[PDB]
Amino acid sequence: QSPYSAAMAEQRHQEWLRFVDLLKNAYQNDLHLPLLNLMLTPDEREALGTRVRIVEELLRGEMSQRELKNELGAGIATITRGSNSLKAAPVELRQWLEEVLLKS
């Protein structure tokens, strides 16, 4: 095959990759912090923490939803997905997380 510089995707996947590309290639050494602040920092530090923290919070023991709206985080949907995530989330996740989840 001979793709000419990939293609112009319709959805957001190019600029996206930029933020990533540096983020990853950086952690290799230690610039990921200064880079993180370059293309990721506002709703990011807020909403991104949340999601990886609400899911890793209840998907660790058994449950935990009666924590009442934490407002600063959400309190409506994103808080109750971590549960149904069993299906909601992709399937290729159980393939790896079996290991990144029980290992912790």
Ligand X SMILES: N[C@@H](Cc1c[nH]c2ccccc12)C(=O)O
The residue ranges that bind ligand X (CB under 6 A) are 37-38, 41-42, 51, 54-55, 78, 81-82, 89
Residue 44 in contact with a copy of itself, rule: CB under 8 A: yes
- CA nearest to 32, candidates 50, 40, 15: 40
Give residue for tokens 């112009």.
8
Q: Interface with a copy of itself includes 62 (CB under 8 A)?
A: no
Q: Is 47 within 8 Å of 72 (Cβ atoms)?
A: no
Residue 82 binding target from a copy of itself, ligand X, none, CB below 5 to 8 Å by type: ligand X
Q: State both tokens at 34.
A: 């200064």
| Contact partner at residue 20 from ligand X, a copy of itself, none, CB < 5 to 8 Å by partner kind | a copy of itself
Instruction: Enumerate the H helices of the chain as residue ranges.
Output: 14-27, 32-36, 42-43, 49-58, 81-88, 92-102
**Site residues, a copy of itself (CB under 8 A):** 10, 12, 14-16, 18-27, 29, 31-32, 34-53, 55-56, 85, 89-90, 92-93, 95-96, 100, 104
